Design a protein around this nucleic acid. Sequence first.
DNA 1: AGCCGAGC
DNA 2: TGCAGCTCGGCT
DNA 3: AGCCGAGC
DNA 4: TGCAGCTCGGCT
Lengths: 729, 729
Amino acid sequence: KGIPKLDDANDAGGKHSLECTLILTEGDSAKSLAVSGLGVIGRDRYGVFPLRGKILNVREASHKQIMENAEINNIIKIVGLQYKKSYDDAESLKTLRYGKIMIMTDQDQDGSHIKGLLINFIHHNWPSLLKHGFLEEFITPIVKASKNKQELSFYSIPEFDEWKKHIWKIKYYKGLGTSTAKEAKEYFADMERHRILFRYAGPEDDAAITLAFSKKKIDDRKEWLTNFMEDRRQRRLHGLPEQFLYGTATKHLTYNDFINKELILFSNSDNERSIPSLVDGFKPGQRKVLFTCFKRNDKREVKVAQLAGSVAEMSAYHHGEQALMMTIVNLAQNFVGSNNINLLQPIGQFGTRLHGGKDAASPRYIFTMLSTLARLLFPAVDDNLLKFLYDDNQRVEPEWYIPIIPMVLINGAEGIGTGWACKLPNYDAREIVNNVRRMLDGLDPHPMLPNYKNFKGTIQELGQNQYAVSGEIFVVDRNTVEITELPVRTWTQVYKEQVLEPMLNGTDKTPALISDYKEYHTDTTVKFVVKMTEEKLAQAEAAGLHKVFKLQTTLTCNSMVLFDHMGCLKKYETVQDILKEFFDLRLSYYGLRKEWLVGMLGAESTKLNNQARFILEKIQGKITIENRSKKDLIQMLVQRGYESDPVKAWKEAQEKAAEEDEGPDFNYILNMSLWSLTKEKVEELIKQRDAKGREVNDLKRKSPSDLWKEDLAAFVEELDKVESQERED
Amino acid sequence: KGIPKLDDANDAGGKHSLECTLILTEGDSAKSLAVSGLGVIGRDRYGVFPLRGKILNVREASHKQIMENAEINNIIKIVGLQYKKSYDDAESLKTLRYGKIMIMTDQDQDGSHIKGLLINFIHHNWPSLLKHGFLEEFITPIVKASKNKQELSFYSIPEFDEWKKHIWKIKYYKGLGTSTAKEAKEYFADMERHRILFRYAGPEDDAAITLAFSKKKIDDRKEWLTNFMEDRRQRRLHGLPEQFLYGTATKHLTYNDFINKELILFSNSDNERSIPSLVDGFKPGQRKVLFTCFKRNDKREVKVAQLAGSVAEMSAYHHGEQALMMTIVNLAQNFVGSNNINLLQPIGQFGTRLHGGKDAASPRYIFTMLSTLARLLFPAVDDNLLKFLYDDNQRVEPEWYIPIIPMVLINGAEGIGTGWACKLPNYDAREIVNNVRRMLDGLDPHPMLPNYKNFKGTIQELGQNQYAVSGEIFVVDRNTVEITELPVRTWTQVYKEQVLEPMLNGTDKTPALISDYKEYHTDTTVKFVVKMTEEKLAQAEAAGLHKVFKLQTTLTCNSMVLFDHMGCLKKYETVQDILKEFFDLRLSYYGLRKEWLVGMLGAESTKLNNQARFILEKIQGKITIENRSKKDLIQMLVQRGYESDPVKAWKEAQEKAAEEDEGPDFNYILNMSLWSLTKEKVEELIKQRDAKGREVNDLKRKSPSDLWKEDLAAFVEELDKVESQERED
DNA sequence: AGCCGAGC
DNA sequence: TGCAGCTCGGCT
DNA sequence: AGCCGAGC
DNA sequence: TGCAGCTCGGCT
């Protein structure tokens, strides 16, 4: 033909076309898996063609984007399909080169989404094909369990998890690429277990597909996921299993059951990775990046590409690394309209306001590291209070961090899921610190306007969650105006191509409005000088300059959707709602921080006490350890008043409160240096001990608010340092 | 005006053409440096055009490769040159678009080489231009020193090194890319000290250029570098300076002085990075890689691209990282005809014999780590005997590693320099181990034939350093032969395309000789089955099958050129020369290893002695340390028989033995565990002490030859394990 | 006529 | 940043 | 009609 | 493994 990545069945287009199956694979390695799996014999009736990734949702796409979609058009050419055609009698089916399409994807949520889009494609264009078995799938296992003789295959994590309810070598298949050639030829030998047939069952199949993929069914999807989330929350409260879909010998799957028990898992997982948490402002990928950074604790820059590989490994990030690198870049950007406080330093070219960051260099050629602000906003001390998650016996990132200000409002959370989307604008950090200080003194918080670091324009409320964002334009003389700010997130080059150039050149609907203009930007600032006739500039000030030069955009925030501290999606009407809920939790954790520090400092002081009485007890000699025995001396030591390691006797302890959530050791004296008994080391132990006694008391005095205020002071000091240093470059 | 990377002087080609200078830069960053350095003002009379890297040596190039060289053709179009033309009267000069070329390169040896090739280009094609000031250079500093007010520039490392004027912040410029825009505009403001003009002085200039770049002057270059190396040995023996070339206010440099004082430094550095050392078989880049691996001590695979960045940093490798990655790949390859013992593991697709390794994947996508054989061949214990080099104030790789067999013959050292080249074939490791064992027992070594791991053919001597290498071909029946080995370094696809295909298809000079052939290879083996008429097969066996099917190559080794242990180039006539010279050195270092271990183990036992007598003294109470003073016991313990840390009293001392190359510490008792006074710590010290006494005695009895034999045994066992494991995959 | 490889 | 097509000497 | 970004 | 052109919802 003329399609490069296609491997056409030898019998395709011939006389056995209707006995031919085209295999559509998620990506190029899946294709390789298919071709080796099919072998020599399989090339007669089985084609293989790979799609790059997600494909166009044709159901309400535009005519133009449909007719220009090379991948959709390739499928149509391979299969021999024809739009508007009905495939019912024997003449219609003579034009097909293939009789069926078999979909082969990762056994994961994003695979289910691709299958859904393919189903959506056939359902919307050739329902005569879809009602008569034209579509199947080739499933493969997500997890395998091998005892010694017999090898097991599980097609979903809940199936595998529940099989553990019996009593031994476990391998995980993250994508089709994990399988080997020998495993592939195995799968295709057992076609009867791996081929599943999509059955069309009635109108409820149409309703289901439409519910998942129609632009007119956003409300229905909201209800649909709300049921799923609460209903899952229930089974998961009453310890019931979570249902899975490929445990039976059934070779049939209705479109309704696919949508409602498989595609819905993608939709829910999509919201989980795309909608941020109220508590720390992160999405899970972001949180993993930052957990990895905290773990490495890099004193020097790290190449973005390398940090991504490190993040993937250290935190169990199972997606492609390009996206992770894009996430790292987005976290480090610091131009006007991106982050108000970038937690990662952009060491290299991470993007500018001239192109909205799309001029960032390759992640192989730029570097980053923690901003000095990062551990001031996410104090390491508080790590002792989080719930670290597990991914296959590996401890990874927490469910959320508990920062000292609501980061969710500092950098403007944004995410698109299914059913819901999130858009929060940026808020000034100092204004938030002040509102926290107000609430900490029993005052009501002040209402807050959106505010973008280094933005020189103005933002004014219009109604609730509606704001007028304006740049800066000045009249210079009767012929000249100067533009010195664009509205937030209007990029310099876009404005120049879409506003000034049409004003200079005229259009078909409008003649030219300006006579000339020149540019005078820096990397981080905007200066256009625009020339006009006296008359035209007089009618531009009359008609309002911000209007004429399109220096005004609306900003509407009626979709502030976030996961609360419990992991429930929730819609916040105002940012003050968000700030009160955050405040209310963060103040609780300061209470546990004070509690936790009391326990540890106490163990540290009780420790320093046993360490103390021993040494000065053998300074004058009331106990002997010379040529005794481990046997004797531990029992000798319990016999007297000496405690087994109090720090290790307070860590094991606080465990056991969290255990129930979802021998004697005197080494601390005895591992002590032999030096510890000398007057210029004994006097230091008494001071250290007496200092530690005061440490617990100096903190015993403090309120949680006192601790929070301390953190806030330390933060604003560094923020002053860091931001003015930024300005001197 | 159709060339993409050129920035043409606004006045180029116009009427001031002969006042225009084209600037040729080493790469695209140098170009950028030139454009910002020149600014708006400089674009009238100054062009900028970048060359990718090294360029064609046109002096005896072929007509075809000259006429097809896009870069040389680009220069000719930009400047307006014309071959065979003489540029003398005013009509001839009317065709030039530019009056002179200014060369801008790194201030390093590879920059000088590029300048030389450009000079060579002009000298060979337009001597009327080169004799009348057509060529200049723009030098920049390699080192800068900034005091507080005044900033200094050095244009050669010996000049910066030669400045005994001492009493302040030193920066190094590795390439033109180190400079900033501000530094560039500075350089171009001071055009008068950065522009140097090449002067043609007489025939000695022609002789010098010809000496450096003519294919007929290899012998002369050999003499030329021999003088340089020996004369340098002298200037560096009596502690005299090495003259440098840009310290004066002279703005003129003859071609003869450029060749003989600047280009020669490239020629010598070229041999140093391309000609291996006899002692360990490495080139300096390779040695740096392996030093980095030994340092990291990676228990797990590392991305090749990442290891390269690590090597650059950890070992001060100042060249581009693409080349380093190629070196890592070459070190890890293990197909037939590459390494007999790959010291790095090829974890991924590092190349196959089907394409001579040129099918290796990208270094961003493949992994490696030390072979378990590496520290068996280069024992870590022996690192204490090496001379680690210094780059700036960083300790880096040694001058050579001294392995337990002559690695220079295991993997076939090869390199192309200037004046000399090196080619060693592979030699069987077990045959070398046996020859070392023979020499270790006072026997003469056996002569050795080249031998390639997994090569199934034969290698036979023809004369001195000449060998017939043969693949394997069999007669199967009256119509069929089978080819099961190609001669070493004949790659499968090349043989198929250049031998079998012309035999199958015929050519214009010869008709077809075979009727069919089929392939049956693995990734690591060769199987062709070839069909012929009975008559044709009979005339092929008569004429000899290895001849007919070109399964025989000659291997000639009359250029076994290596740096000896002193860093002098040497030409070895036979492989036995190489092995005897290696033998005498390696046997010496086994003597120092025995010496070193004796000294160290002794300090360790003298240490365990003081540590021992001490504990037994306050076991029964002959010393009191309870509540005394650091003041007191340093003199208290020295007053009595106690030695300050002997290990750290054997290292500090042994330092100063290498110094001449070019208070009391009793913490080891007192930092001891408080447990040191215990039933199971006293007897544990007595065995430990008494074991260490036996340690020195078991080793005092051993000969150096005994130690080498031990190493060889441990090595051969692991080579047996590793090589059969290789065969079961 | 072009390979071998450490460089630009 | 490295590109792509070259360097350098001795064979083949 | 297209941005916003975490995914394939 | 990523490509390139998409998904998904709410504005603009």
